[model samples]
Target chain A: VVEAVENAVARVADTISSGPSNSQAVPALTAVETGHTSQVTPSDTIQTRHVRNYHSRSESSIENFLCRSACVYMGEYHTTNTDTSKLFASWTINARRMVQMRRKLELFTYVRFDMEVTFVITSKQDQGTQLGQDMPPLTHQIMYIPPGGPIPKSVTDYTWQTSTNPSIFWTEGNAPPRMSIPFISIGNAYSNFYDGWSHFSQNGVYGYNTLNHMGQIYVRHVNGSSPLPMTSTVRMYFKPKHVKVWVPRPPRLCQYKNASTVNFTPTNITEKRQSINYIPETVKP
Target chain B: DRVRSITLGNSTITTQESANVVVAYGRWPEYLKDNEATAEDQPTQPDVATCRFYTLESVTWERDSPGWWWKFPDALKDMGLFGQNMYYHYLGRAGYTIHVQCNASKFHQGCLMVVCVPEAEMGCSQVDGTVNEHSLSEGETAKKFASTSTNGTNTVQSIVTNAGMGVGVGNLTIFPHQWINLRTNNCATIVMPYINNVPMDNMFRHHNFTLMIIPFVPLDYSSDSSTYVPITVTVAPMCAEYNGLRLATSL
Candidate 1:
């Protein structure tokens, strides 16, 4: 642990002074490339795929749990309509984590993770109810949204490469990656979603459903009975007096879901997302 | 990823300013010349999407109390700092402007650069930033204030609530999802809608701020331009979306 802390701190300094390093190099990021000139974004019951579940937790889980009442829960949306990214492509996305400690521990600083994540929903238990078009079985289908590792073969775009490095951890408890905290599983047998996602081609999927309020992606089983209340976790993670992020410029979109998205992110947007080269030694008393 | 990073706020400020600068990195409207390739032109980093001026709508801080002064350009050397002076004027297509009324001696220097991150890497690190959240109670209309600050660090609302969410409104430095206290939605109406703050001990206390809200006047309810509100003071703009709102809301 001591060695890890020292190495991580040194890594921060090195990035600051030398600029991008090969030790922790970023690949071209355009390897699994391919997209389109146009497509359909219907407005039906097609936003969140099947259900939600998977990994219990990972280094990124902290940020997941922390974003509860905080992010705007704008209500569930549709992709065949709104959030389309999840429909066809999988992703390796970024998640933020910040910790404030007063020398309580050696590794002191926020940790950022790029998780190879995918949102899925499976049969919690088995039963029949849905009356769509001869729909099969349904007994409170479960929804799982996991991040970090074990990248599903279907998920083409994920942060599996960059996250493999230990540089992302700012402290101890090198927990394996898990699903974001804002969800509930089968034994819990609830329903609902993970905000939402949108993508163009396959690689352009974005989790922040553009304009929808946070947590706008929800899925309801047949008859649409119980709407699940987001599971709240009781943790030691402190909600500090200050929370922040190094706002990165939007990435170049390979494809967008619709016209509104294009206008929202005009063809004129500049600046790509940059990394924090160094950790500033605070002058705190 | 290193384009132009931001800086900290002014330590000593007789006056402060909060700017709702509209920085659109778009390629149109001809004149401003901020034309760049569409997200399609240069496809890089497939995992993340492009963040526009509109995606951002909240504010929080980095170095809170106990940590008062942040050296501009702090420890990060590659970043190009913004808001150097009160007359913070610049543009790439979307114009960036701040409200400052300080003279040479005790001039208005802004703090907390407004950064807009995406959904993936959102929220504060491991739950930092102790905060206070409150409401207008009884569905009351927006309140009014006599005067405001020009240094850019103005408060929109001040509440004495539980330490639930990040405290204070209209005045924050860093803004992640889990940070920024909001009683409403689709907030941060400005292009890159956000608030500003000063980095100081007074501004560091959990419940240190008091938001000065703008009364709802149908006459200028959704009026455009920063010229609508009294330029001297900073108030929360309404929750306007193209036609209308957001910035400050308190008494």
Candidate 2:
């Protein structure tokens, strides 16, 4: 009788353990790729932008931005006892655990990710260029921020090609080998000509007009969390580099050429500097 | 006007500013005192009536007061810094303009930049002796001010209340079921159709509504029949609008 009871408990345990497996599996993201048309702006709020060519680059800023609120609940449960009544009680206990886990998971899943970035372009304004004469809306794409690893295969329009040095390049351009932004998952597309992106085609894109002030983009998920997996094994991208990108005129917040005349308030300067280093440091410092 | 009395720490004074009258308190003679009793009775006087009374609180500094000059500068009457220069300026009022300036360094010459301007003629100007390059077009800058002031005082009200259920009147009842279902059928119809036949766009501006469905099952045991079939009903706000109503409405 004891052996039978033990078998019954094991059977019930197996059924409970298999519950998650029976549920529809969430498909893993695909291999990382790139396209000629995609570039991350200075104000790419979805992921922080880092100058890839810089020596010993860090993604403290991008990582903080992407992972600021990026956490989900994980439940771990175990059951003991093999009697039918104990098995039933164990199921009830597991159900209670699941209810608590689900409540926390729902809370973890329900978050609004908001990022507002402002870009400014500093170019000698051309009097002849009407607002309507600008390029089409630009598209900026991004990869997941941290747990940095190789690009995923799910992003369709862009694909990563492994070259001689294992360098990844966008299939469209085949230009230069590209490295994913170390800890970011998304990118953006912004049109140079703001008169609402009508003039240019996908290939004829030019760099931003000004020292591209206002090259900023703010990304926010008003509902679900980021699609990126939150696991140590999940290598993510951060800070962009090597890929051909359009450069707008340098930002000019000052009036005229006099730096004294501009509203050059030093906000988040040290924070911005530290964002360059990916290694852990005191963010508050 | 019946003379009103005011109280300070202990002293009292009387003035002719009557109750219900909107008068500046400091200018009154009775700068101290608590009760506002009628003046000493006179022969054959008319009856004095009191509707409402308002008192203004004043600050006095002692040895322990939190100020640099409260203890040393015995002669300084303006030792009180709390609530000294702070005053609410109603928009469009004369002399009510604000000039907020930020400097990278102190001493006034670091980099004098005007951060905000409450009025056109009152905004930051080039140093008094400096040359003026351009003039702000009349009311051009003021137009930007109008948008900021619309909900200046109603921020908390707008946050706590979901104004999307009805018009901007802020009186609409936010029913849990109505918010979860965006379909018109789930919403409470406006009683006065004459005033609003079509739903206003503002009615959808609330951000705090959720839609959820709950299913109930019977507790009775019936082995031979389908007795425990769950009855599911959505008792929440609508997510979106469709043809006339929900797809299940017609079926």
Instruction: Give the TM-score comparing model 1 with the true structure, all chains together.
Output: 0.21
Across B1-251, the per-residue lDDT of candidate 2 in tens digits comes to 34544433223334332222211111221111125322232112111111011122222212122111000001111212211111111000000011111111111111101111000011122211111111111111111111111232211111111110111112211111111111111111100000011121111111111111110111223345332222111111111111121111110
| Interface RMSD per candidate | 21.3, 24.8
Docking class of 2: incorrect
Number of backbone-clashing residue pairs for each candidate, in the order shown: 83, 83
lDDT of 2 by residue, A1-285 (tens): 355433221111111111123334333322111101223332322323333342322443333324322212122111122332211100010101222222222211112222321111111222333333332221222222222234333322132222212221122222322232221212232211211011211112111221123211111111122222111111111222222222111222112211111111111112244455667657774
TM-score of chain B of 1: 0.18
Ten-residue stretch with the least lDDT total in model 1 chain A: A9-18
lDDT of 1 by residue, B180-208 (tens): 11111111211223221111111111111
Runs in model 2 with CA error above 4 Å? Answer: A1-138, A142-285, B17-77, B80-122, B127-251
